[model samples]
Target: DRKAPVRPTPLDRVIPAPASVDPGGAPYRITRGTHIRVDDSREARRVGDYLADLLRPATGYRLPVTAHGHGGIRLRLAGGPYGDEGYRLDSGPAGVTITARKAAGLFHGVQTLRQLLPPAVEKDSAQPGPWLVAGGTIEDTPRYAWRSAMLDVSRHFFGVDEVKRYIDRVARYKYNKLHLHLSDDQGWRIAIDSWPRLATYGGSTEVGGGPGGYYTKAEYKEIVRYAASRHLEVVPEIDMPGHTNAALASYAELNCDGVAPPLYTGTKVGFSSLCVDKDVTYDFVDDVIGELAALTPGRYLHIGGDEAHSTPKADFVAFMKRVQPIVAKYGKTVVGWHQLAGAEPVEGALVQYWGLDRTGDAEKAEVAEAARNGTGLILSPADRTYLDMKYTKDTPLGLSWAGYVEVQRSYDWDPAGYLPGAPADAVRGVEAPLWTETLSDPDQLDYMAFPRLPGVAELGWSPASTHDWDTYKVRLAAQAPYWEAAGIDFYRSPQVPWT
Candidate 1:
């Protein structure tokens, strides 16, 4: 005879929940003897991979994963979809089950699972203490569809290994957009066939008192493929017109006078721009973009519209009309820094507003105008999102262009709150620019980007309603181990001394 049916105790009560775990007492529960079944083949593979990566090493208990024709995970719709795109997990004694409308949803559900795992799993260290499975199912999905990070490798190139490290970090944080600043006044990082000197000369530099590097087409392709595998779309920015000093120096014919000298190193001079009147310059841009489009699978191309300080207004207008057709021909959207709006606005372009310290009333008006003109906006105001600045009173090796930007400042920014009347959809997202003017080495890069990057990541991924500095501090503290394991030089919040 079966013994009297035993009542299952609450999982959280049975296991001393870690201080880090904040389930909010959701409907779902995580427990042992749970079975996860997949209905979709694609999602099955994704869930299998995620579980293998996040759970297997810790528990040594392989999940009984199976694909079925109909059975799928159940989700609570109120909080949000469980996985990446409206998927959910409902946990109970039967174990945790994730359900999604599509395979992507299932993959996202797996991501939530990874997030739910105790911090120990990510540290990859032998557990010094007993590990208990986190109980409770979470139904969560990214608040924003276009969470992204922009890496400027133009001024100071990060080789394949460094770039791959960044991609790994981006993937870990659930960011889907990777914007590569591939050109600047200092260097041209991409290889263009029609312009051989772009790499041979433009890529090499004695910029900021150091040697430079470039990425071959093959190397770039490898990066694109790797990013694709991780669901990160690589958008290559061939910064044009304004930031063409390096390109113009490489090919003298493209310059305004056709007799410009080779580019100088470590100078932030802003006069250089592709000759607006030259047909050859247009052809060069078209050819370069065509090659970049072939290599990059993303749908957006960033034609940097920043700091064209010396560009004649009439010439700028003419140049916009000339490049409009080319951008349209490629079936891609053109994204430019805010200066793109100085001339007649191009229809369907994305305007990235990073005006230096210009996030006040006037800045808001310009963004409104851009939105009204059917152009999208990417908020990266220098006062807020620029990561290369110093962190506090202490200056880490670099010219002090601006004051320090501590982690709290980065965490405090509210991208959505700044803009008024701009359609939420019109705001593509926010990006933290790690301009390399001062950032030369990986250690410096890590120092400037870390802690802050996570803050940006949370703002881009999690809902504003759920954001809390207190909660983030706790999570941030917990993430230290992961950073250490990944060999990242993350910054810890400065301790406050009570008087």
Candidate 2:
């Protein structure tokens, strides 16, 4: 018997809302006969295989990958108007075609295609479905090159699996960077060969006294490899000077008093500093950055300069002066917290601004001055983009020193005009920093990250003209089912009428 075709999804339903959408005609429906076509390049084949793997279990379709095909799905690496990280997705009644200049774009188009189908497509097992993709074309690309999320694993050690899980979650929204906070006062989460005890002794405890752990060189490499597979660059953070208690405790030689402190298990910050005047301090910095840079392939390395309260202003600047060059000597660009503006920032350095609205004018001016002088800024203003802040006072899993951040607070701010004096051109991108002081598991991460994380992603990927709370809330709500099917335990915020 004949039946009506599945309804076409609204062209703007995508989370980051594509830059251009043209919807009409009959939607594309995948059947058992459909085959994934790719060009001769291995990149296209790899993406084809990835798409097939995602669809195989849920659709129960062979979805064979072939060198050539028609009236099915096509992943092509054609040089088109789409930029390096952009793609053009066309879904018609006969088939769907995703074209991009690069593999990263093809992978992103795959994510959009996944969203166009029913939520059941995310299930590991087969489910009933028309398996339709809404009839349309989406021309999409990111607004900012540095759309990112920082996971502070130092306060709480999240194993490789947990980090990978987070990467999977972020990549779906087209984020390109994962900044891992690998060391802090509480723990050192990456192994260092020269400083052998950094992992064994220092990476041994977390906030609230949990048995903190560290990633071996192999384990850390696995994270980098996995993140790269998802097209997410990994920026490894080794917080120095102030957050050095974990390192200081591991070796007494790293301390001014030549006596190591006990491993910290509480959640206090800004009280510790490396021995800034010691030549051994430079040796330690050189060794750690060298080992870390060799393991990481990304261009940026974050040397945290925030909350270095124990070090004097002159010593803090001197410390950064010595440390920034060591990072450059290893062929990595330096990324420091906004406090780095107080120091002499080198060429091509990026300062991540995590200040609050109430953060004094003079401080913002210093950062603005640095921006005017050619240093780039990554806006992650704590009040707006800190994911670990409680949604409300009643929320059980996050902190509120930056005040409660409901969904809109995180989404509605415009980064281009965010800082008063910074030139719009100087603003490089945005990031949502999730400090793990109160979080310890994946579900907690999901609860705090989702709903808000996607919105932050939208800010980075979509144009400023597309931002609207009312329209965005509906699109955000539509993501719930995918989260449900994917087993992401996101918070059911009353702000949106979640499906």
Candidate 3:
């Protein structure tokens, strides 16, 4: 009697885990001659190039990005009910096919395809691999519109290469939004030709005193381009009305006292603010926003309105009211810290909530009340999603002001239903922010972000029905090899069951 062939493991695997995964027939194998067949269109071919370029270094194969049909990997952009950012992936013995409604959806499928392959495929150099994808069908879409991460480059500036690296790291986990905290009390991180010093003099310092740096207009554009290739929207934040020491120092007119603050290099908040009720302040802002708007291609511009203790209550409210319109005038939506909820959020505005566990009930109520007024919310919940929070008291890096955020705790919360008083429908999404108060290198970003970052990604993408920390630990454990191959130094949390 003949023996039946054994089936390989299921490709029912992905981070920010898919909505539905069904292990199907026999797996598909990709040989060296596999060609990526994309639809004969500009975007399809462009994205096909994106996937091909990513694969060339690892597979060391001259894989052609072709428009011919009936091939190894096929990307079809047929509009459907799968939504703009959702996709369906099917793998069989013949090959793998990905279908989506748009290029964003196809790009997401590209990410899934990478995860389906052997972890060694992430290597920059060619490695011997019997590259096979488990047979399955994955139907996936994000639960919320925004799947995001924020990098605070203002406190401790990261160069263009570092920023691109960070973008690459987050893109793998399916993060579609990257918020750059560009300007702060310590330094500015984006160039404004209207005020060249915003990038030169104001950018030349950091927390704890060192020569920080800023991205020139061309450099910033390169970052935007690179992030766009990965399907990440760059939301540049020029913190104003607060955290403006750098701006105030660069131009004395921005100071309420008409004297520039000595270039600040300490980790203090609420001490600096733009001069309220000053025509010069608005003129400076209009130019900054006009320049930044011209630079940013995304819909949202984060005009930071947090921790403006230097400005009085009336002035604070008035500042937000005025700044919110200026952002809209430049053809962008307003995104501010949760503190903006204390004021009124303009129509279509999004308020990011970064409160802690011990956050006052009244403060919580203020946010909830704002939500009832039709303002959208992006839940960060500092205690849970702040990647800069130390894992433990003994951790040498990171701060504990928001208390420790272990991997389990970071993954255990629900954004939609977490706040008892916040409106369910008003919840836009979530963002995990890494404040660079201490972090200075890519490794530090990786160490703090990895295990925890994916969890946040899952929360924002996967369905609540699939929210199981027990099972998630296993799925997430599978991602380590890919990171390791990419030279990402991840924190091997004792909590996860890594193989």
Candidate 4:
């Protein structure tokens, strides 16, 4: 046997740990003869095919797909205890079987299965094949419906392939939302046909004055399509009021002075605001939101309400009051930064709290009041969940305005009680936001996201009962080899004892 000696990751060691895990008896090994079996449904076959595609290259296995079988890898969809995004995996000598209430559950189960085998299985080329999943049953389900990662493509635009790569990375961790920060002070990263120059002119430059880029409408649709395939909803964000330099610079009328500023390529915020008093401003909002709503199929739209320093307090409130209805007119729930709370957020709106530890009680209370009045809250406390914050002071790729977020610090907080007195039902979910002020390339993006990103993922998916840092660090350490194989240039936090 030319197969090298292998030590597979224990089945119970799955990240986000699974709701319940039981390991016993003998392990199951995949050979070239192993076949992937699925139910009669197309969803099952689709997930089966996806798994086959992932496994075939690395394991050099045929992994044929069939309608039904007694043995080999089996994927089935049926009524069960599994929830919409949950799955039950049973692996033994009889061959691995993944059962879920829906296809999304099966896909998530596949991710768990991938982690069960040796990390070498992630390679695109064939590796020594003793591809194994230890004997076990893992029943998994997400704790929150809105586990997400927000990527700020505005500061530095990522092309279609780059965005797809990010989707793939987050999907593996079972994140359900991809919040695209499509517009900001530095640039506009999506094509708005009604406002042509928003892409042609405003999208032309990024921070540091590089000729930035925008995704054409077709490309944007492709991103949405791809994200859907991974069960991730693309929540498009067009930051308004404060982060409007790019939009204001695109049209002279957008400015109160009727003179467009030179295209800004700096990382400064709160220096620009939409002309709230102008009637044309509402026209602009109506047109942009209408266009974006048509382009996006997801249920949510993020209107950035953060750091609108130049706009007067009353103006900010007026802008949101007008803008929230525009978003609703097009059929999307409004998602905004926590500042939206102060602006009197509407029903069903989701306010993403990105506040710091030192943020005033008054500010936190404003968000709590919004929650009390029917708005949902997405916890993204900057100190704990901002992926762009440096791991330590010496970390090369990120900023530290929120203070250094070491791996433990990132994963340590509980989202349910993060905000004191915030109604439990009001906490809709959690999101890890990566604001790319200094990150310009994929490696830098990867460097700042991983290790920390998974920590947030666990916080969103795993039960609070599973919240133990000492054990989580070990499971986290095992992921390094997978990252190495997958070419994720992740930061090696000293907090984790990498395997």
TM-score of 1: 0.83
Clashes of each: 10, 0, 0, 0
- Candidate 2 residue pairs that clash: none
Residue 444, candidate 3: alpha-carbon lDDT: 92
What lDDT tens digits, residue by residue, belong to model 1 across residues 45-143?
Answer: 655555655554554545455564222233222333344554555554345566666555655555555544444455443432122334464445666
Across residues 33-63, which tens digit of lDDT does each residue of candidate 3 receive?
9899999999999888988888887788888
- Candidate 2's residue-wise lDDT over 82-151, tens digit each? 7878999988887899999999999999988888887788788887767889887899988889899999
For candidate 2, what is the lDDT? 0.89
Candidate 3 lDDT score relative to the true structure = 0.87
**Residue 490 Cα positional deviation in candidate 4, in Å, after optimal superposition:** 1.4
Q: Model 2 misses residue 149 by how many Å?
A: 1.0
Task: Indicate the TM-score of model 2.
Answer: 0.97
CA lDDT, candidate 2, residue 180: 96
lDDT of 4 by residue, 364-431 (tens): 99999888899999999989999999988899778888899999998987888889779988988899
